[PDB]
Design a protein around this nucleic acid. Structure first.
Ligand SMILES: [Zn+2]
Lengths: 50, 49, 224, 73
RNA sequence: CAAAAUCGAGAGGA
DNA sequence: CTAGTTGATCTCATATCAGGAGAAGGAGCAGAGCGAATAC
DNA sequence: GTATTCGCTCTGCTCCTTCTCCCATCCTCTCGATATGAGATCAACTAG
């Protein structure tokens, strides 16, 4: 019965399919796109990234 | 049962919150009125359609 | 004399197949084929190599593979092709220095770092220049063999041709075959260098038994 | 790991690429991966892992390396 | 004129 | 110019089970297709 | 001279084994464990 606006759900879905394949919200999908090294090292798995 | 539930849900939900935040954080509405990420690619031509 | 034998064998080389980029190459084993006295063959080849008419290069595909090349074909083809394809890129000058200084001086098969660093004042940068020229290849850390640019194509064709010829002898009856029969037979497309060339190589390395019969010299595979 | 990968993509005896640069299979990899050296190099690896011979090269068996601990066999 | 370590274990609080 | 002193520095030497999930690499099998090769 | 094989290659499919990363935030407290000198060089004196 809860409620959440639609803008937020749409933004999450569109972020998560914006590259043409399904992107997982994990170090496998988030940390493998082209975000540049420093943000990647911040999220997870620092040593390998740098 | 109720006590253990309250005491064992929290870790996983916290992980999900962290993971989503790091996923989406840098998307923002621009002066073009578009929505874009840090890399400057389009995510939504207008916020929320 | 070995000098003649290398001359005739060099004639058999199909230069057109390698678009005259590679100088003609003769394998020491083939020199043994035309000169049965193996020891005299080796002594006279050493004689020639000392005189500076020919170079001997470790082809590597077999530990006993030493290719024999006239020095002038080597110089001509390397200068022409390397400098042409490499006009401007730096190692042209280094290779020029190498051909001018080392090759006339020492005909040795391998080059060790100390010699080039001291006797010839070559630097690490220039040695890398040569290595990228194809002129040197790594024996060990700080050791390199002389080499012909582009030899890989010839090596591949020679290997496949040798194994094909050996297979053809194997599939003949007895595992035997007469030399005239082999030479007259239509060469497989794999055998790109010509059959006489490969036959001499097989005979010289004792891979095939040469039996002089009333009908000629028969090829038989030694029992393995 | 990067060392192993660069080795497995060059000639252990003559020190250059097992595969040629001008082949379409690598030219299209270059065209596809611009600004993505990770994807470039991984494409070159998965293309070259099937190569087992150095073939204007040195034509010698390039050994299937392995690792145990900190060591390369 | 700034004086007062680090590392592990345990028990707690919201 | 030129012999004598002082300190700093350095060397040697003494004994006595109730994780899991996902990626990567290699393994073994399976058949397709093409070079030559027998053979009708 | 073309079937016909056939062996060899060349993918390439599964299938297993290996390896490597991750696990809510913030805060208070207690308790236990974790040399000595002879000699030589050298440089700055320290004077003649
Ligand atoms: Zn090589």
């Amino acid at each position: 019965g809860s409620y959440v606006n639609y803008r937020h759900l749409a933004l999450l879905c569109d972020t998560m399919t914006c590259r043409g394949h399904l992107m997982a919200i994990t170090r496998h999908g988030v940390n493998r796109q082209d975000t540049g090294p420093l943000m990647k090292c911040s999220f997870e798995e620092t040593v390998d990234v740098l | 049962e109720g006590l253990i539930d309250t005491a064992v849900k929290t870790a996983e939900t916290g992980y999900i919150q962290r993971r989503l935040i790091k996923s989406m954080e840098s998307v923002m509405v621009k002066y073009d009125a578009t929505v874009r990420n840090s890399i400057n690619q389009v995510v939504q031509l207008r916020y929320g359609e | 004399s070995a000098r003649a034998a290398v001359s005739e064998l060099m004639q058999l080389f199909p230069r057109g197949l390698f678009e005259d980029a590679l100088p003609p190459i003769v394998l020491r084993s083939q020199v043994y084929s035309l000169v049965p006295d193996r020891t005299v063959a080796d002594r006279q080849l050493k004689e020639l190599q000392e005189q500076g008419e020919i170079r001997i290069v470790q082809l590597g595909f077999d530990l006993d593979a030493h290719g024999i090349i006239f020095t002038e074909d080597y110089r001509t083809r390397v200068c022409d092709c390397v400098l042409k394809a490499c006009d401007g890129r730096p190692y042209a000058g280094a290779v020029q220095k190498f051909l001018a200084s080392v090759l006339p001086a020492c005909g040795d098969l391998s080059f060790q770092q100390d010699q080039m660093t001291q006797t010839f004042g070559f630097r690490d940068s220039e040695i890398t220049h040569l290595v990228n020229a194809g002129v040197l290849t790594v024996r060990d850390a700080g050791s390199w063999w002389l080499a012909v640019p582009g030899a890989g194509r010839f090596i591949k064709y020679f290997v496949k041709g040798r194994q094909a010829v050996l297979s053809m002898v194997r599939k003949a009856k007895y595992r035997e075959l007469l030399l005239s029969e082999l030479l007259g037979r239509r060469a497989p497309v794999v055998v790109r260098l010509g059959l006489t060339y490969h036959v001499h190589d097989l005979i010289g390395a004792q891979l095939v038994d040469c039996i002089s019969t009333t009908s000629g010299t028969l090829l038989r595979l030694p029992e393995t | 790991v990067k060392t192993m990968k660069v080795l497995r993509c060059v000639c252990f005896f003559c020190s250059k690429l097992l595969v040629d640069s001008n082949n379409p299979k690598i030219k299209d990899i270059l065209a596809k991966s611009k600004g993505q050296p990770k994807k470039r190099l991984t494409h070159v690896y998965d293309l070259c892992k099937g190569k087992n011979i150095c073939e204007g090269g040195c034509g010698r068996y390039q050994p299937r390396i392995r690792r145990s601990g900190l060591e390369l066999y």
